[PDB]
Amino acid sequence: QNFLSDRRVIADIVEIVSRTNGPIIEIGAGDGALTIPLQRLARPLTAVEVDARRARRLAQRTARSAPGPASPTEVVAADFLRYPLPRSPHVVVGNLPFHLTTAILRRLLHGPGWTTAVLLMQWEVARRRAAVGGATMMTAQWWPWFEFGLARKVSAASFTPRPAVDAGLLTITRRSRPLVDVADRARYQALVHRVFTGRGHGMAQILQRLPTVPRTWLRANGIAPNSLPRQLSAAQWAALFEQTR
């Protein structure tokens, strides 16, 4: 949709991806703005492009710049939302269509194997996922399993055609030691939803009006009674879940 035309952003993404290890899967491969540079990292690479005609053209481009038939990126003409991710370690890299960002993020967050994701998306979504100015409900809902980092802002002028809003480069890393067991994910995410939408002014007031916490719990866990849900850390949410489960 909005193809990346700024080579400096390509350099920045390749720099981040170069510090990771293992196979790479790229979403929204387009004409190969990131695929060709990632292929030069000499690691196994799969490039996913939903437009079959464009994917056929990309397969010719990757093959031409590859060492040769004996040594080789796999180009897949598929919708990433239907693409089965391997259960083995890999890194995901993508330039996401802005209207599909939340759906692709949910697909990845529920998916297996990937240890790092490097994703280009809307600046406002990337800021919220990385908890800039505080966490949002969706960020806190996934924090026991993943960490999020805002690598850089990317102007709408870095794409052709230009999108209506600016973009952000977001990194996501799968925690090797989850803070909450994956089997308790639904119950954990429901608790987070309940606190972010509960009535009351400050954590002390919100936790009193919920159907689940000792009077001494907040301050014992380093939480100011007037604090907002967006100010809690991942460890504090995991401790609240352990307390109310």
Numbering used by the authors: 13 to 83, 85 to 225, 227 to 259
From the study:
Erythromycin resistance methyltransferases (Erms) confer resistance to macrolide, lincosamide, and streptogramin antibiotics in Gram-positive bacteria and mycobacteria. Using SAM as a cofactor, Erms transfer a methyl group to adenosine at position 2058 (A2058) in the ∼3000 nucleotide-long 23S ribosomal RNA. This subtle posttranscriptional modification blocks the antibiotic-binding site in the ribosomal peptide exit tunnel. Erm38 features at its N-terminal catalytic domain the classic Rossmann fold, an α/β sandwich that contains the SAM cofactor-binding site and a helical C-terminal domain.
Here, we present crystal structures of Erm38 from Mycobacterium smegmatis in apoprotein and cofactor-bound forms. Erm38 comprises 386 amino acids (NCBI WP_063844518; Uniport Q79N53), with analysis using the Database of Disordered Protein Predictions predicting that the N-terminal 12 residues and C-terminal 124 residues are disordered regions. We therefore expressed a truncated version of Erm38 spanning residues 13 to 261. This truncated Erm38, referred to as Erm38 throughout, has a molecular mass of 30 kDa and a size similar to most Erms from Gram-positive bacteria. The highly purified Erm38 formed square plate crystals that diffracted to a maximum resolution of 1.9 Å and tolerated up to 20% dimethylsulfoxide, which makes them suitable for ligand-soaking experiments. The electrostatic potential of Erm38 includes a highly positively charged region that comprises residues R119, R140, R141, R142, and K166 located at the protein surface. As these solvent-exposed basic residues are likely to be involved in binding the RNA substrate, we produced an alanine mutant for each site and compared the enzymatic activities of the mutant and WT enzymes. The E61K, R119A, R140A, and R141A mutations resulted in >90% reduction in methylation activity, whereas the R142A mutation resulted in 75% loss of enzymatic activity. One reason for the paucity of information about Erm-RNA structures is the adventitious precipitation of the Erm–RNA complex when the 32-mer RNA substrate is mixed with the apoprotein.
